[PDB]
Every structure is written in structure tokens, then in C-alpha cells.
Amino acid sequence: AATSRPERVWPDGVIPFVIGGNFTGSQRAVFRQAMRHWEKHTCVTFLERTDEDSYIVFTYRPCGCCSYVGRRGGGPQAISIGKNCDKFGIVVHELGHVVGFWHEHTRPDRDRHVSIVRENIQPGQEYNFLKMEPQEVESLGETYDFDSIMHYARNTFSRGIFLDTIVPKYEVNGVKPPIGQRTRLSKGDIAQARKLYKCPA
Ligand SMILES: CCCCC[C@@H](C(=O)NCNC(=O)c1ccc(-c2ccc(C(=O)N[C@@H](CC(=O)O)C(=O)O)c(OCC)c2)o1)[C@@H](CC)N(O)C=O
Ligand SMILES: [Zn+2]
Numbered sequence: 001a002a003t004s005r006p007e008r009v010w011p012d013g014v015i016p017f018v019i020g021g022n023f024t025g026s027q028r029a030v031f032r033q034a035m036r037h038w039e040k041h042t043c044v045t046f047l048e049r050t051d052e053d054s055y056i057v058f059t060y061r062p063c064g065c066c067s068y069v070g071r072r073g074g075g076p077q078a079i080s081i082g083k084n085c086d087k088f089g090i091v092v093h094e095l096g097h098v099v100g101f102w103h104e105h106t107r108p109d110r111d112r113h114v115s116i117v118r119e120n121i122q123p124g125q126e127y128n129f130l131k132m133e134p135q136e137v138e139s140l141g142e143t144y145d146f147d148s149i150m151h152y153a154r155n156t157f158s159r160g161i162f163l164d165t166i167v168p169k170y171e172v173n174g175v176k177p178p179i180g181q182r183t184r185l186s187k188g189d190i191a192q193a194r195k196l197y198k199c200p201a
């Protein structure tokens with residue numbers, strides 16, 4: 001679910017950052033490592049902000065709303081981290097928003113790849129499962145990525161942990177594809193980010 005908006009792509013892949021107060025040394029290091037993980041596999045670079053007008057701010061607040069998708073422009077933008085969402089893989093996911101990715105399951109073509117089980121969604125959280133409108137996403141010829149760091153788990157926003165809200169529609173390597181990994185960027189995330197940022201081959 002890569003943004004279609006050219007203005008949201010950070011110029012030259014350069015993303016200035018500020019780490020806010022109220023984070024421990026340990027948390028600050030994880031933010032650095034998550035950024036480095038993005039840097040190792042793509043042409044995106046994260047720089048300590050000096051006088052840039054547009055930059056990200058690691059903002060201490062409860063997990064949830066919101067981390068801005070792509071470059072906002074004309075000022076700072078939040079990447080929001082709290083006590084229950086400060087681990088490496090979660091920060092890598094939220095940095096996925098920063099670089100310009102929406103959630104994978106919101107791709108305009110997602111109904112070919114996953115079923116949404118509406119009856120299992122927590123009432124009031126259904127809006128999180130709406131597709132992006134087709135003018136808002138350009139997938140750059142890349143296949144729907146079940147292994148994406150941007151993909152929801154099977155029971156995200158579910159009424160109960162044993163109730164699925166998202167079910168892949170078909171098998172990959174003779175098994176239903178696992179979804180919701182928060183370990184590392186997938187092959188697909190890297191390939192798609194490289195296309196989005198026009199990285200040298
Ligand atoms: C109502 C939508 C809820 C989305 C929550 C979601 C999320 O952040 N998803 C991705 N983002 C969005 O969908 C989305 C929509 C609008 C915005 C957004 C984000 C940040 C700002 C911002 O930087 N605000 C400033 C204050 C300000 O300048 O007004 C701040 O927080 O300091 C934003 O500002 C309005 C444009 C919008 O994000 C989060 C869940 C854990 N998640 O998945 C994280 O990985
Ligand atoms: Zn997210």
C-alpha cells in the first residue's frame with residue numbers, strides 16, 4: 001500500500017529525525033536500530049535534524065493514533081511510540097508509515113488476497129479495515145505481500161484472540177501464508193521501497 005502521492009515521497013530518500021523526551025537510552029537505541037534496518041536494505045537515509053523544515057519526531061504517547069504516512073511537508077510530523085509498542089519490529093512498521101506505506105491489507109486489490117471477517121471485528125474498529133481508495137495507492141507492480149511488516153496479524157482488532165479478522169484466501173508453498181510478522185522487513189517491503197525511492201540497482 002505505497003502512497004501514490006509524489007509529494008509524500010521524501011526527497012532523495014533523506015528523512016531528518018528528532019527523538020523526543022521521555023524515552024530511555026534503551027528505547028532511543030532501538031529507534032536508531034530500526035532506522036538502520038531500513039537504511040541497510042534501501043537507499044533511504046535517516047539524519048539527525050538540524051534546520052530542516054520537514055522531519056519526523058519520535059513522540060512518546062500511548063500506542064495508537066498516529067504516525068504520519070510519507071512526508072507531510074511544511075513542518076514536523078509524529079512517529080508515535082508508547083510503552084506497549086516500542087520494540088524493534090513495531091518501530092520498523094511505524095517507519096514503514098514514515099517512508100510512505102499504508103497498511104498492506106488496505107491495498108485496493110486486497111479482496112483478491114484476504115477475506116475480512118467483519119463479524120469478528122471489535123465494534124467501532126471496522127474503519128481500520130476499509131480499503132484505500134484507488135487514487136491513493138500505487139503498488140508499483142508489486143504483488144500483495146503477506147509477509148510485509150505492514151500486514152496486520154490474523155486477529156488484529158478482533159473480539160477475541162481465537163477469532164480471526166483477516167484470512168488469506170489461498171496457499172503459498174502448500175500452506176496458508178502467515179501474516180503479521182514484526183521481526184524484519186520482508187523481501188517485498190524492500191523491493192517495493194526501492195521502487196518507491198528509485199534506488200540504484
Ligand atoms: C484514526 C487513524 C488511526 C491510525 C493509527 C495507526 C497509524 O498511525 N496508521 C498510520 N497513520 C494513519 O493512518 C494516519 C492518518 C492520519 C495520520 C496523522 C498522523 C500524524 C499526524 C501528526 O504528525 N500530528 C502532529 C500534530 C499536528 O501537527 O497537528 C503530532 O502528532 O504531533 C497527523 O496530523 C494531521 C495531518 C495525521 O496518520 C497506528 C495504530 C497503532 N499504527 O498502525 C501505527 O503503525
Ligand atoms: Zn501501522
Ligand SMILES: [Zn+2]
Pocket residue numbers: 001002104142143144145148188189192
Ligand atoms: Zn507491500
